[PDB]
Amino acid sequence: EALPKATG
Amino acid sequence: ERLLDELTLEGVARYMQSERCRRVICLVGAGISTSAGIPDFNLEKYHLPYPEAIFEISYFKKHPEPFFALAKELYPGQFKPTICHYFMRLLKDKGLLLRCYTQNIDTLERIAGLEQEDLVEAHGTFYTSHCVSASCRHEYPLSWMKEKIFSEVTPKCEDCQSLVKPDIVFFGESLPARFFSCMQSDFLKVDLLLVMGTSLQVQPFASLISKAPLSTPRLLINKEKAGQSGGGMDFDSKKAYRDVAWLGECDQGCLALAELLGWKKELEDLVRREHASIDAQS
Ligand SMILES: *CCCn1cc(CCCCCCCCCCCC)nn1
Ligand SMILES: [Zn+2]
């Protein structure tokens, strides 16, 4: 898991 | 649960001049920099699998050179902040700004006078860059990166020769930890949201509008209505009570709001002095 990612 | 007296710009101004409005948060996007010549996104010259690959971390990891070439091509001849940036600067100067959350990487907030404590650069910035090697992580300022970009030299670390990347969040990258640290405290205390120049289509930034308390007024200054669904924006229903939409250029809306607050002359002098000071030192 990772921190929330930049998504369009 | 209704703090605005009317769902107009004048109601927002009168609320800003009331005892309830002590902490204001700005959420800004590409629309506040378009009048400065910075594009709100050719590319054939870069031979990409798809046009969006230039903005994704996967392709940059594969081939970083097209990004730096495009950075030179789109590099603005001047970094002149807009009326909106200096309106936020006035908010800072008068003690009303709690935080500015920005989607932009153009550093115009910092050039306008906002400092690190005032800013959450949710998508990173060009203002600093770092060597990509985890055992080095050497930091370089904007002048170094600009000189490397314009000489068309791929930026390499002066200590270990590894690639040096601007501190920006590509699509597919995790947002910086400061975003998630600030959002926990800021959006429990916020009295007003000023959403300027964004259509709220990039996540998780957009979801920020639903973190505010349900009584917190939210003013949208944008060329189009956005955020309508969930704690979404409600400008036009019969149950509307706190959301105001001002449709047009962001500079114009900020000018009107500043005039309603009595700040017209000060904002004028600030913008003219700073634009002339940037034209001089150019
Ligand atoms: C979820 C992340 C959303 N996001 C990513 C970005 C930046 C993507 C790369 C932009 C490249 C800009 C090149 C330089 C232009 C001129 C300024 C120096 N934004 N939002
Ligand atoms: Zn290094």
Side-chain angles (χ1 to χ4, degrees):
Chain A
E1 194 213 287
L3 287 182
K5 296 170 175 175
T7 64
Chain B
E1 62 148 14
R2 170 158 173 166
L3 303 180
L4 297 181
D5 59 60
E6 70 172 8
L7 304 188
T8 73
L9 201 62
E10 275 180 308
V12 177
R14 285 191 292 271
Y15 175 72
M16 290 181 64
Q17 298 177 314
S18 71
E19 62 160 53
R20 281 298 306 262
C21 191
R22 298 175 190 152
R23 290 165 295 266
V24 180
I25 291 184
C26 296
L27 313 178
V28 298
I32 76 160
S33 297
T34 49
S35 72
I38 292 163
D40 179 11
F41 59 87
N42 294 349
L43 298 169
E44 170 270 305
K45 344 170 184 185
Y46 306 105
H47 299 83
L48 312 170
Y50 44 96
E52 299 81 5
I54 194 76
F55 305 124
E56 295 202 306
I57 183 59
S58 185
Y59 189 80
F60 179 86
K61 287 191 171 189
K62 296 188 191 304
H63 315 276
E65 312 82 4
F67 169 81
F68 291 110
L70 174 67
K72 187 186 180 185
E73 177 172 351
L74 302 186
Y75 214 95
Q78 243 173 357
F79 290 94
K80 268 218 209 71
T82 70
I83 295 175
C84 187
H85 296 89
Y86 293 109
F87 177 85
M88 294 194 294
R89 167 72 183 278
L90 288 189
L91 286 177
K92 167 195 177 68
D93 286 346
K94 300 175 188 299
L96 297 166
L97 185 68
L98 172 62
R99 206 85 54 187
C100 170
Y101 289 72
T102 180
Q103 305 181 214
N104 303 337
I105 62 179
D106 50 45
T107 75
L108 287 185
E109 299 88 354
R110 293 176 176 264
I111 300 175
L114 295 193
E115 294 170 289
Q116 171 65 93
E117 323 86 57
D118 308 318
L119 282 169
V120 173
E121 292 146 326
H123 300 155
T125 174
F126 270 96
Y127 191 69
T128 48
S129 307
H130 282 83
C131 165
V132 301
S133 180
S135 57
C136 183
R137 305 294 303 151
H138 191 130
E139 175 182 315
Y140 297 89
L142 177 55
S143 52
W144 187 94
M145 180 55 59
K146 180 199 172 186
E147 195 280 314
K148 296 305 174 187
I149 288 175
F150 271 89
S151 69
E152 303 185 55
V153 167
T154 303
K156 297 301 200 68
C157 181
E158 293 176 355
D159 286 336
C160 68
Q161 305 306 313
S162 296
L163 188 275
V164 176
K165 189 189 96 166
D167 287 352
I168 70 175
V169 178
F170 284 84
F171 280 92
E173 285 197 86
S174 300
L175 272 63
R178 169 164 176 79
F179 178 87
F180 308 97
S181 175
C182 290
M183 66 158 302
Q184 297 273 343
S185 177
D186 290 352
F187 284 89
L188 299 178
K189 312 179 174 186
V190 57
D191 302 311
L192 174 66
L193 286 186
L194 300 181
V195 188
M196 302 180 289
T198 167
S199 292
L200 301 174
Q201 287 165 351
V202 178
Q203 291 288 353
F205 189 95
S207 69
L208 285 174
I209 71 167
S210 65
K211 310 290 184 176
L214 294 174
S215 61
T216 296
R218 303 180 296 187
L219 164 65
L220 176 71
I221 302 178
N222 198 43
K223 292 188 183 186
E224 65 180 43
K225 274 175 180 170
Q228 300 165 302
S229 295
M233 297 289 215
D234 178 14
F235 307 110
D236 307 313
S237 86
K238 295 189 176 182
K239 289 173 279 192
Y241 72 100
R242 66 150 169 170
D243 296 334
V244 180
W246 193 96
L247 302 188
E249 293 281 358
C250 293
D251 286 352
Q252 292 268 293
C254 285
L255 282 176
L257 187 57
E259 175 179 327
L260 291 176
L261 294 165
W263 304 347
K264 173 176 181 175
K265 172 67 169 171
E266 191 182 0
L267 182 59
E268 279 193 23
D269 290 351
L270 176 58
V271 172
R272 291 178 64 186
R273 174 241 296 171
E274 290 296 338
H275 284 191
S277 180
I278 293 177
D279 280 336
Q281 67 180 285
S282 78

